């Protein structure tokens, strides 16, 4: 049966193993003899399966670690709400959202940093924020600072409860592996219980507190006069005054006259003209429908009662001629190995973050967020980066599963075996695809540069010399534009105005606009595809060739991350799947960097801007994307050089912090190249010279210093490279968008 079964008091509570630093691993528990011990203590900190063999113990450690992480996240939600409560201008922004710059952080006057408390409107001096939390709270219906303070206190209480839960579920009552492996009940409760009831509760909150407050705010009622949420929750007369369908009660729900709730449950679509964002009635209907969908989906898998599915049987039933045994063994793999689950979950989380980035900008969900140009850019770019990082984590943990938890006795003649048996074909064909795609997509840019420099615009791959029109994307956009009448008759507007339709604008600034697709869009989209394909090549090759290869038949024996297998065979450098991830992180970094550059330039040139009373559409850069994005010279001039002005000229102003971070991120990006290009042998010899200098003075340490390991040097170089590049883009985008928008 599916049952609760836990062991009591499995681990005592004591600081003795806090004092003992390297207790978790057998080798580290001995104590230090070189400084590599210190690094390995951090490297192997959360490698539970290397520490303990018991899957039960690994699961318990993971469960309590999840609790600790949730405590951290609750403290983070608390910081956001509390800073909005105290050190902010949320009330001023709520009164006047368009002119007030949102700010929820204040520096102290010590060393001249007080200038960073710039003019953000509302009689408030502080650092402008770009996280969209102000718009989030306006959507939620928060109109006072006491609400922010009290939800911050609640978040702190939840963080304390989560720390307590993490301690309790490891030191007092830890579950068993039998409890952990109840995947069917876990799926049922996560679908119906977590997602379904979360959506249902949020739909109720929206219907009862967000629709009335936001409708009154859009009407013009100032926040002081707004009736409080507790009054709105039970005052059915006021809710009938606002939405007439509420006077009918819940009888139109229990009887299936659901059409009576059409006023506050809508399928309007488009964007609200007042706030320039999605209709909150639409969002409430959305969350209600999703609650129903998830509760329906969560009753699929078997439990104590006879009804339900078995994922084992579902997988085993799917086997084809070209797949042999098919999905046999995958249920056991995913029930026994945590790394496989981590790989799948990280992949889907990253793809979801990217999909979130794509959806939020095209369909602004929060009020006055579309006009808040820094918020849109910041959220899109952030979620893109998080998505790429999660995808590479997925690849890494797939490789870890392959190295450690793979077994042919289990996975004989199944899909995993059949994939490993033609990995060579897979990687060779992806290699050809990568070469072809990169050659075409980048050589079109290079051709454009060559012909422009040769003074031959008639020979360009431009919109007027040799057109490469995205006919299929244009067709899909046309279908979406015509959808509200023909293929979605109950929809009163298009899902997103990017496909087509009217120009939504709040005050002078433009919320959303149709985004045209031409030759430059074709080129940059194929560039995106090329970058994604090369990243997939690197990561998939690392995962497939983690067990072994033609170069190293016994690569699994060496481990997951190892420096090499010597200079033999002409050199076996970075053969490890870890090193494959190390290289794929550079490539997802390049991919996401080009994606965010495309987003920034396209939205600045074609979407964001201002519209006058007559209708004079004036964009930030002036539509230069369509004619300058055809060349790498144009990318270097009209995007990087042109928009770096607001960063470099920021000294002596509130964005001077962005200027400093621009320089510092540049410095760290360059500092990374030392680790990336150099090698441990030189550094160990230099440390030997320095150690002689210290020993001459009788102060050479007992913990002998050593150059960093090879894998560690690669990791440090990659981390510094990513930090420097991402910080450079962060400062550049934030300074540019805050200055111009």
């Amino acid at each position: 049966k599916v049952r609760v079964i836990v062991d009591k008091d499995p681990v005592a509570t004591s600081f003795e193993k806090w004092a003992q630093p390297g207790h978790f691993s057998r080798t580290l528990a001995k104590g230090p003899k070189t400084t590599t011990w210190i690094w390995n203590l951090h490297a192997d900190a959360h490698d539970f399966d290397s520490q303990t063999s018991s899957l039960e113990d690994i699961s318990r450690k993971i469960f309590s670690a999840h609790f600790g992480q949730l405590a951290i996240i609750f403290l983070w939600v608390s910081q956001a709400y509390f800073h909005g409560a105290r050190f902010s201008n949320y009330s001023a922004w709520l009164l006047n959202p368009t002119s007030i710059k949102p700010s929820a952080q204040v520096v102290w006057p010590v060393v001249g940093q007080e200038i960073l408390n710039g003019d953000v409107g509302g009689g408030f001096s502080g650092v402008q924020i770009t996280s969209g939390v102000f718009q989030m709270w306006r959507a939620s219906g928060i109109t006072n600072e006491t609400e922010l303070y009290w939800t911050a206190m609640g978040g702190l209480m939840m963080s304390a409860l989560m720390v307590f839960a993490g301690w309790f579920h490891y030191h007092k009552a830890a579950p068993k592996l039998e409890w952990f492996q109840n995947v069917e009940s876990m799926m049922n409760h996560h679908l119906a219980g977590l997602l379904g009831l979360g959506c249902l509760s949020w739909s109720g909150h929206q219907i009862h507190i967000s629709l009335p407050i936001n409708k009154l705010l859009d009407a013009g009622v100032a926040p002081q006069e707004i009736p409080l949420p507790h009054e709105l929750l039970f005052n059915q007369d006021l809710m009938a005054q606002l939405y007439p369908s509420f006077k009918k009660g819940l009888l139109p729900f229990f009887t299936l006259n659901w059409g009576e709730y059409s006023d506050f449950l809508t399928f309007k679509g488009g964007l609200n003209p007042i706030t320039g964002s999605l209709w909150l009635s639409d969002t409430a209907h959305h969350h209600l429908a999703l609650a129903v969908l998830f509760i329906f989906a969560g009753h699929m898998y078997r439990t104590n009662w006879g009804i339900g599915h078995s994922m084992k049987e579902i997988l085993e039933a799917h086997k084809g001629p070209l797949t042999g045994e098919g999905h046999k063994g995958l249920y056991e793999i995913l029930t026994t190995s945590w790394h496989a689950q981590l790989a799948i979950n990280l992949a889907m989380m990253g793809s979801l973050s990217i999909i979130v980035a794509h959806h939020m900008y095209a369909m602004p969900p929060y009020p006055y967020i579309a006009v808040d140009y820094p918020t849109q850019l910041s959220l899109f770019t952030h979620h893109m980066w998080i998505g790429g990082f999660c995808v590479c984590g997925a690849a890494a943990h797939g490789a870890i599963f392959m190295v450690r938890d793979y077994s042919p006795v289990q996975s004989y003649n199944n899909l995993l075996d059949r994939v490993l048996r033609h990995r060579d074909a897979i990687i060779s064909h992806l290699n050809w695809v990568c070469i072809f795609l990169g050659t075409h997509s980048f050589g079109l840019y290079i051709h454009n540069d060559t012909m422009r420099a040769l003074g031959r615009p008639q020979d360009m791959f431009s919109d007027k010399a040799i057109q490469l029109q995205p006919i299929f994307a244009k067709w899909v956009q046309s279908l979406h534009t015509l959808a509200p009448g023909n293929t979605a008759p109950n929809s009163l507007a298009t899902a997103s105005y990017a496909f087509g339709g009217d120009v939504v604008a709040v005050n002078g600034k433009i919320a959303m606009m149709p985004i045209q697709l031409g030759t430059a869009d074709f080129l940059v989209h194929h560039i995106h595809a090329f970058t994604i394909h090369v990243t997939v090549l690197i990561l998939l090759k690392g995962v497939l060739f983690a067990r072994s290869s033609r170069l190293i038949p016994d690569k699994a024996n060496l481990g997951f991350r190892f420096p090499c297998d010597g200079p033999g065979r002409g050199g076996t450098c970075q053969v490890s799947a870890w090193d494959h991830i190390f290289l794929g992180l550079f490539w997802m970094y390049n991919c996401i960097s080009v994606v965010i550059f495309h987003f920034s330039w396209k939205m600045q040139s074609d979407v964001w801007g201002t519209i006058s009373e007559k209708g004079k559409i004036t964009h930030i850069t002036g539509g230069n994307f369509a004619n300058s994005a055809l060349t790498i010279n144009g990318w270097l001039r009209d995007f990087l050089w042109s928009q770096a002005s607001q960063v470099i000229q920021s000294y002596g102003s509130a964005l001077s912090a962005y200027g400093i971070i621009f320089l510092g991120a540049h410095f760290i990006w360059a500092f990374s190249l030392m680790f990336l290009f150099s090698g441990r042998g030189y550094w160990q010899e230099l440390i030997e010279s320095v150690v002689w200098a210290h020993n001459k003075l009788k102060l050479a340490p007992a913990i002998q210093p050593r150059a960093l390991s090879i894998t560690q040097g690669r990791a440090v170089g990659l981390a510094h490279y990513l930090l420097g590049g991402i910080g450079t883009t962060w400062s550049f985008f934030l300074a540019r968008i805050i200055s111009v928008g």
């Binding site: 004591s14 600081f15 003795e16 806090w18 004092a19 630093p21 010590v110 060393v111």
Partner: protein, 40 residues
């Protein structure tokens, strides 16, 4: 505050963070009380 927790607080990273915290606070307070000292 058993001997084990005192030992843990005596560990190298905790001590580094504590001492550099005190040092940074000392420098910042000296800046507040004697600000803009581009000289002696």
């Amino acid at each position: 505050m058993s001997k084990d927790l005192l030992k843990y607080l005596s560990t190298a990273p905790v001590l580094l963070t504590a001492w550099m915290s005190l040092t940074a606070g000392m420098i910042i307070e000296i800046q507040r009380f004697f600000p803009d000292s581009l000289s002696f």
